[PDB]
Amino acid sequence: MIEKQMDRVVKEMRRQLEMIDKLTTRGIEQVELLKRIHDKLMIRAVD
Amino acid sequence: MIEKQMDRVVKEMRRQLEMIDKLTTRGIEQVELLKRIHDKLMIRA
Amino acid sequence: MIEKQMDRVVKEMRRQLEMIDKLTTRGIEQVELLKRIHDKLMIR
Amino acid sequence: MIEKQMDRVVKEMRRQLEMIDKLTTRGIEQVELLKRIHDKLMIRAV
Numbered sequence: 001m002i003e004k005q006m007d008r009v010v011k012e013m014r015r016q017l018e019m020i021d022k023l024t025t026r027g028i029e030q031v032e033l034l035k036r037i038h039d040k041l042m043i044r045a046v047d
Numbered sequence: 048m049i050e051k052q053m054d055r056v057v058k059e060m061r062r063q064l065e066m067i068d069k070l071t072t073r074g075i076e077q078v079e080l081l082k083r084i085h086d087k088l089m090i091r092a
Numbered sequence: 093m094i095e096k097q098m099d100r101v102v103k104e105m106r107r108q109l110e111m112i113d114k115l116t117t118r119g120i121e122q123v124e125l126l127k128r129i130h131d132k133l134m135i136r
Numbered sequence: 137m138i139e140k141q142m143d144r145v146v147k148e149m150r151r152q153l154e155m156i157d158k159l160t161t162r163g164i165e166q167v168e169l170l171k172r173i174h175d176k177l178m179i180r181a182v
């Protein structure tokens with residue numbers, strides 16, 4: 001049945017997109033951590 | 048200064064990741080809409 | 093010597109974005125598995 | 137109707153995913169640009 005094949009695909013896509021979402025959130029955390037590093041450099045760049 | 052180049056890049060990356068996030072959310076909505084389509088098909092046969 | 097901390101973060105971001113890339117490519121495959129399903133339905 | 141509706145959805149998703157892909161590639165470029173910045177910092181450190 002194609003409807004059962006469609007089901008397997010839909011579940012997989014949901015699962016892929018949820019992972020991409022988790023990774024994206026983890027990336028945004030890293031970007032903040034990168035902003036903090038930029039800041040430390042700026043503080044050191046003055047003295 | 049490198050530090051100002053780093054700043055421009057960090058800001059850009061955040062902006063890219065926020066877009067990817069919006070698109071991902073939009074995709075999950077579409078996947079639900081696809082689950083609804085699969086259900087209609089199940090009802091039809 | 094933060095730079096080592098910056099390094100650890102940059103490597104991790106590279107790793108995260110490469111995963112997102114693999115998943116994105118897997119999604120595009122799926123999107124075509126779906127177009128084939130659409131086609132089978134049309135043939136019906 | 138459902139078949140054509142499904143088609144709309146699928147085209148939309150393919151478009152969303154291709155954008156995510158472009159952005160991901162742009163992120164990878166930025167990460168390289170960041171590696172280069174780290175290196176410059178290393179050179180300036182000594």
